[PDB]
Design a binder for this molecule. Sequence first.
Ligand SMILES: CC(=O)N[C@@H]1[C@@H](O[C@@H]2O[C@@H](C(=O)O)[C@@H](O[C@@H]3O[C@H](CO)[C@H](OS(=O)(=O)O)[C@H](O[C@@H]4O[C@@H](C(=O)O)[C@@H](O[C@@H]5O[C@H](CO)[C@H](OS(=O)(=O)O)[C@H](O[C@@H]6O[C@@H](C(=O)O)[C@@H](O)[C@H](O)[C@H]6O)[C@H]5NC(C)=O)[C@H](O)[C@H]4O)[C@H]3NC(C)=O)[C@H](O)[C@H]2O)[C@@H](OS(=O)(=O)O)[C@@H](CO)O[C@H]1O
Length: 215
Amino acid sequence: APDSVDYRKKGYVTPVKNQGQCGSCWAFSSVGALEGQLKKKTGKLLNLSPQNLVDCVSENDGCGGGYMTNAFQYVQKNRGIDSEDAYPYVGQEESCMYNPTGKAAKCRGYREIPEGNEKALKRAVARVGPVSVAIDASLTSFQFYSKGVYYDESCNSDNLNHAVLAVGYGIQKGNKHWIIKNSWGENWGNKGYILMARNKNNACGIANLASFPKM
Ligand SMILES: CC(=O)N[C@@H]1[C@@H](O[C@@H]2O[C@@H](C(=O)O)[C@@H](O[C@@H]3O[C@H](CO)[C@H](OS(=O)(=O)O)[C@H](O[C@@H]4O[C@@H](C(=O)O)[C@@H](O[C@@H]5O[C@H](CO)[C@H](OS(=O)(=O)O)[C@H](O[C@@H]6O[C@@H](C(=O)O)[C@@H](O)[C@H](O)[C@H]6O)[C@H]5NC(C)=O)[C@H](O)[C@H]4O)[C@H]3NC(C)=O)[C@H](O)[C@H]2O)[C@@H](OS(=O)(=O)O)[C@@H](CO)O[C@H]1O
């Protein structure tokens, strides 16, 4: 477990996307973890399709919400997920238009990080790569974050309302953190990214619903 890990500079991470008004944060989170794992196994970085998941994962609720565990399981049992280009993001619920032709990645299932364990998450991130996580992002301070290690006293580790991607971790001026890729576009936060407090009593429920795909 190195003292600092950032998979953006190891080439595992694609640009920041925009989910729009659709509750598909889970789909981008999952896509992102699969992208990171695709790069690790094959050496190719490629945008995967959140729209495929939104439309085709019945185990979830489309733009109404969903978990990353169900997405990984669907991709596994579907024997594929399309690239972004083969199944573009629209920001709305549609019929499942999965095309085996545009298949860009596969998945042998998923592993879950033990609940509430940031040290376990730390090892998972260091060993596997980008990990899908869920957090409380309902606070005003989160909306208008820009710089620094994000910490807020009112953050509920029980109200998991937003799914994001943990691309690494580190320390900024003594302040331990998680490097978090969001899907609210480049104009949110620090270029679409946010640093969130780490080893600070499971802040925002960062380590409560963490998972990664098997490839
Ligand atoms: C999941 C799995 O497969 N296993 C689990 C079981 O284990 C747990 O997880 C493992 C895991 O792989 O994650 C275990 O990993 C171990 O984790 C420890 C703490 O979590 C340690 O990691 S760390 O403290 O977080 O860093 C331990 O790692 C050691 O960490 C450093 C250290 O020595 O303290 C590292 O060594 C130094 O590394 C740096 C840079 O990496 C540098 O090396 S180098 O890259 O620059 O070449 C440095 O340099 C030296 O420089 C010279 C010198 O100074 O003299 C010269 O000697 C050399 O060039 C070089 O030595 C290194 N210096 C030293 C002192 O080493 C290094 O990463 C490592 O030594 C890490 N070790 C391993 C093997 O992974 C973890 O311990 C377990 O907690 C277990 O799970 S359980 O939950 O624990 O129960 C079982 C259940 O029974 O389940 C399994 O699946």
